[PDB]
Design a protein around this ligand. Structure first.
Ligand SMILES: Nc1ncnc2c1ncn2[C@@H]1O[C@H](COP(=O)(O)OP(=O)(O)CP(=O)(O)O)[C@@H](O)[C@H]1O
Length: 205
Protein backbone atom coordinates (compact mmCIF):
# COMPACT_ATOMS: atom_id res chain seq x y z
CA UNK A 1 0.00 0.00 0.00
CA UNK A 2 1.52 3.29 -1.09
CA UNK A 3 0.03 6.74 -0.57
CA UNK A 4 0.86 9.35 -3.22
CA UNK A 5 -0.27 12.94 -2.68
CA UNK A 6 -0.53 15.72 -5.30
CA UNK A 7 -0.19 18.86 -3.18
CA UNK A 8 -0.08 22.56 -4.05
CA UNK A 9 -2.39 25.20 -2.54
CA UNK A 10 -2.16 27.58 -5.50
CA UNK A 11 -5.17 26.34 -7.40
CA UNK A 12 -4.60 26.01 -11.13
CA UNK A 13 -1.40 23.98 -11.04
CA UNK A 14 -3.10 20.95 -12.58
CA UNK A 15 -3.62 18.73 -9.53
CA UNK A 16 -6.97 17.15 -10.45
CA UNK A 17 -6.18 16.64 -14.13
CA UNK A 18 -2.77 15.08 -13.42
CA UNK A 19 -4.35 12.87 -10.74
CA UNK A 20 -7.27 11.71 -12.87
CA UNK A 21 -5.04 10.61 -15.75
CA UNK A 22 -2.13 9.25 -13.73
CA UNK A 23 -4.49 7.12 -11.60
CA UNK A 24 -6.15 5.96 -14.81
CA UNK A 25 -2.68 5.13 -16.15
CA UNK A 26 -1.74 3.08 -13.10
CA UNK A 27 -5.04 1.20 -13.27
CA UNK A 28 -4.18 0.02 -16.78
CA UNK A 29 -0.98 -1.33 -15.23
CA UNK A 30 -2.92 -3.66 -12.95
CA UNK A 31 -2.70 -1.53 -9.80
CA UNK A 32 -5.81 -1.17 -7.63
CA UNK A 33 -6.06 2.61 -7.32
CA UNK A 34 -7.91 4.72 -4.74
CA UNK A 35 -8.18 8.48 -4.98
CA UNK A 36 -8.98 10.87 -2.15
CA UNK A 37 -10.67 14.19 -3.01
CA UNK A 38 -9.55 16.50 -0.19
CA UNK A 39 -10.72 19.60 -2.07
CA UNK A 40 -13.84 21.37 -0.70
CA UNK A 41 -15.04 22.07 -4.25
CA UNK A 42 -15.04 18.29 -4.86
CA UNK A 43 -13.94 18.77 -8.47
CA UNK A 44 -12.60 15.24 -8.95
CA UNK A 45 -15.67 13.91 -7.13
CA UNK A 46 -18.16 15.78 -9.32
CA UNK A 47 -16.25 14.41 -12.30
CA UNK A 48 -16.32 10.81 -10.99
CA UNK A 49 -20.10 11.02 -10.99
CA UNK A 50 -20.28 11.66 -14.74
CA UNK A 51 -18.95 8.36 -16.05
CA UNK A 52 -17.03 5.58 -14.38
CA UNK A 53 -13.41 6.28 -13.37
CA UNK A 54 -10.97 3.40 -13.83
CA UNK A 55 -10.37 3.76 -10.10
CA UNK A 56 -12.29 4.20 -6.83
CA UNK A 57 -13.07 7.64 -5.48
CA UNK A 58 -13.37 8.71 -1.84
CA UNK A 59 -14.26 12.18 -0.62
CA UNK A 60 -12.29 13.24 2.45
CA UNK A 61 -14.97 15.44 4.03
CA UNK A 62 -12.33 16.47 6.59
CA UNK A 63 -8.81 15.86 7.83
CA UNK A 64 -9.95 12.80 9.81
CA UNK A 65 -10.38 11.02 6.48
CA UNK A 66 -6.82 11.76 5.30
CA UNK A 67 -5.13 10.67 8.53
CA UNK A 68 -6.93 7.30 8.39
CA UNK A 69 -5.99 6.69 4.74
CA UNK A 70 -3.31 4.21 5.80
CA UNK A 71 -5.98 2.15 7.60
CA UNK A 72 -9.06 2.83 5.44
CA UNK A 73 -7.61 2.05 2.00
CA UNK A 74 -4.92 -0.34 3.23
CA UNK A 75 -6.20 -2.99 0.81
CA UNK A 76 -5.41 -0.75 -2.19
CA UNK A 77 -2.14 -0.75 -4.16
CA UNK A 78 -2.00 3.05 -4.40
CA UNK A 79 -3.81 5.87 -2.65
CA UNK A 80 -3.52 8.90 -4.90
CA UNK A 81 -4.52 12.04 -3.00
CA UNK A 82 -5.86 15.07 -4.83
CA UNK A 83 -4.70 18.10 -2.85
CA UNK A 84 -6.95 21.06 -2.07
CA UNK A 85 -6.42 24.61 -3.33
CA UNK A 86 -5.55 26.07 0.08
CA UNK A 87 -2.96 25.76 2.86
CA UNK A 88 -5.21 23.97 5.33
CA UNK A 89 -4.46 21.38 8.02
CA UNK A 90 -5.03 18.93 5.16
CA UNK A 91 -2.12 20.25 3.10
CA UNK A 92 0.19 19.11 5.88
CA UNK A 93 -1.98 16.13 6.75
CA UNK A 94 -1.34 14.66 3.29
CA UNK A 95 2.43 14.90 3.72
CA UNK A 96 2.33 12.95 6.96
CA UNK A 97 0.61 9.78 5.69
CA UNK A 98 2.26 9.84 2.27
CA UNK A 99 5.11 7.85 0.73
CA UNK A 100 5.53 10.20 -2.23
CA UNK A 101 4.51 13.83 -2.63
CA UNK A 102 4.09 15.17 -6.15
CA UNK A 103 4.07 18.96 -6.57
CA UNK A 104 2.13 19.97 -9.70
CA UNK A 105 3.25 23.31 -11.10
CA UNK A 106 2.64 25.20 -14.33
CA UNK A 107 5.06 27.70 -15.84
CA UNK A 108 3.66 31.19 -15.15
CA UNK A 109 5.23 34.62 -14.74
CA UNK A 110 4.12 35.35 -11.15
CA UNK A 111 3.18 32.19 -9.38
CA UNK A 112 5.91 29.82 -8.45
CA UNK A 113 5.78 31.31 -5.01
CA UNK A 114 2.56 29.45 -4.25
CA UNK A 115 4.44 26.17 -4.70
CA UNK A 116 7.29 26.36 -2.15
CA UNK A 117 4.84 26.35 0.75
CA UNK A 118 4.65 22.57 0.34
CA UNK A 119 8.44 22.21 0.17
CA UNK A 120 8.64 23.79 3.60
CA UNK A 121 6.27 21.21 5.10
CA UNK A 122 8.34 18.51 3.47
CA UNK A 123 11.10 19.57 5.87
CA UNK A 124 8.89 19.27 8.97
CA UNK A 125 9.70 15.57 8.52
CA UNK A 126 13.03 15.25 10.35
CA UNK A 127 14.11 9.50 9.74
CA UNK A 128 10.60 10.43 8.53
CA UNK A 129 11.48 12.23 5.28
CA UNK A 130 8.87 11.50 2.61
CA UNK A 131 9.84 11.21 -1.07
CA UNK A 132 8.95 14.20 -3.27
CA UNK A 133 8.93 15.21 -6.93
CA UNK A 134 8.12 18.30 -8.97
CA UNK A 135 5.54 17.78 -11.71
CA UNK A 136 5.62 20.24 -14.59
CA UNK A 137 1.97 20.70 -15.60
CA UNK A 138 0.32 22.73 -18.36
CA UNK A 139 3.35 23.02 -20.53
CA UNK A 140 3.48 25.35 -23.52
CA UNK A 141 6.59 25.61 -25.69
CA UNK A 142 7.25 29.25 -24.68
CA UNK A 143 10.93 28.41 -24.04
CA UNK A 144 11.58 31.46 -21.84
CA UNK A 145 9.79 30.90 -18.51
CA UNK A 146 9.89 27.10 -18.72
CA UNK A 147 13.52 27.70 -17.86
CA UNK A 148 12.86 30.24 -15.10
CA UNK A 149 10.59 27.72 -13.38
CA UNK A 150 13.00 24.89 -14.15
CA UNK A 151 15.80 26.73 -12.36
CA UNK A 152 13.85 28.02 -9.36
CA UNK A 153 12.94 24.36 -8.71
CA UNK A 154 16.53 23.43 -7.84
CA UNK A 155 16.68 26.22 -5.25
CA UNK A 156 14.30 24.02 -3.27
CA UNK A 157 16.50 20.95 -3.42
CA UNK A 158 13.76 18.82 -5.03
CA UNK A 159 14.28 17.12 -8.39
CA UNK A 160 11.53 17.34 -11.03
CA UNK A 161 10.22 14.48 -13.16
CA UNK A 162 12.02 13.95 -16.44
CA UNK A 163 8.81 14.35 -18.42
CA UNK A 164 6.11 17.07 -18.38
CA UNK A 165 2.42 17.28 -19.28
CA UNK A 166 1.95 19.65 -22.21
CA UNK A 167 -1.09 21.92 -22.62
CA UNK A 168 -3.39 19.92 -24.91
CA UNK A 169 -7.12 20.28 -25.58
CA UNK A 170 -7.79 16.61 -24.87
CA UNK A 171 -6.97 17.20 -21.21
CA UNK A 172 -9.86 19.64 -20.96
CA UNK A 173 -12.29 17.83 -23.25
CA UNK A 174 -11.60 14.58 -21.37
CA UNK A 175 -13.06 16.08 -18.16
CA UNK A 176 -16.12 17.48 -19.96
CA UNK A 177 -17.08 14.03 -21.25
CA UNK A 178 -16.60 12.62 -17.77
CA UNK A 179 -13.50 10.50 -18.33
CA UNK A 180 -9.78 10.76 -19.15
CA UNK A 181 -7.42 11.11 -22.09
CA UNK A 182 -7.15 7.34 -22.19
CA UNK A 183 -10.71 7.26 -23.52
CA UNK A 184 -9.83 9.43 -26.50
CA UNK A 185 -7.33 8.96 -29.31
CA UNK A 186 -4.77 11.63 -28.47
CA UNK A 187 -1.74 9.34 -28.48
CA UNK A 188 0.43 12.37 -27.77
CA UNK A 189 -1.31 12.81 -24.43
CA UNK A 190 -1.42 9.14 -23.47
CA UNK A 191 2.27 8.95 -24.31
CA UNK A 192 3.65 11.55 -21.91
CA UNK A 193 1.23 10.52 -19.20
CA UNK A 194 2.37 6.85 -19.34
CA UNK A 195 6.04 7.74 -19.48
CA UNK A 196 5.31 9.91 -16.43
CA UNK A 197 3.57 7.08 -14.59
CA UNK A 198 6.41 4.60 -15.07
CA UNK A 199 8.69 7.32 -13.69
CA UNK A 200 6.54 7.42 -10.57
CA UNK A 201 6.50 3.63 -10.37
CA UNK A 202 10.29 3.54 -10.75
CA UNK A 203 10.46 5.50 -7.47
CA UNK A 204 9.14 2.71 -5.25
CA UNK A 205 12.12 0.34 -5.33
N1 LIG B 1 -2.46 19.56 -19.43
C1 LIG B 1 -3.47 20.43 -19.52
N2 LIG B 1 -3.85 20.92 -20.77
C2 LIG B 1 -4.87 21.80 -20.86
N3 LIG B 1 -5.61 22.31 -19.82
C3 LIG B 1 -5.20 21.79 -18.56
C4 LIG B 1 -4.17 20.88 -18.34
N4 LIG B 1 -4.03 20.59 -17.00
C5 LIG B 1 -4.96 21.32 -16.45
N5 LIG B 1 -5.70 22.08 -17.33
C6 LIG B 1 -6.80 23.03 -17.07
O1 LIG B 1 -6.31 23.91 -16.05
C7 LIG B 1 -7.32 24.29 -15.11
C8 LIG B 1 -6.81 23.96 -13.72
O2 LIG B 1 -6.46 22.55 -13.59
P1 LIG B 1 -6.96 21.66 -12.38
O3 LIG B 1 -8.46 21.68 -12.28
O4 LIG B 1 -6.29 20.35 -12.52
O5 LIG B 1 -6.31 22.42 -11.09
P2 LIG B 1 -6.25 22.31 -9.50
O6 LIG B 1 -6.77 23.69 -9.56
O7 LIG B 1 -4.93 21.77 -9.54
C9 LIG B 1 -7.47 21.17 -9.44
P3 LIG B 1 -8.03 20.59 -8.01
O8 LIG B 1 -7.76 21.61 -6.95
O9 LIG B 1 -9.47 20.43 -8.24
O10 LIG B 1 -7.31 19.34 -7.69
C10 LIG B 1 -8.55 23.57 -15.55
O11 LIG B 1 -9.39 24.57 -16.18
C11 LIG B 1 -8.05 22.47 -16.45
O12 LIG B 1 -8.98 22.04 -17.43
Amino acid sequence: MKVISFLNPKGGSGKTTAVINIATALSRSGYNIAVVDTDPQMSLTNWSKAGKAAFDVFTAASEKDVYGIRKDLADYDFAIVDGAGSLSVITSAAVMVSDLVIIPVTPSPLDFSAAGSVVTVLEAQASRKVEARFLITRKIEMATMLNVLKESIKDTGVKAFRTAITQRQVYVKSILDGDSVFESSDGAAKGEIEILTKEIVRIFE
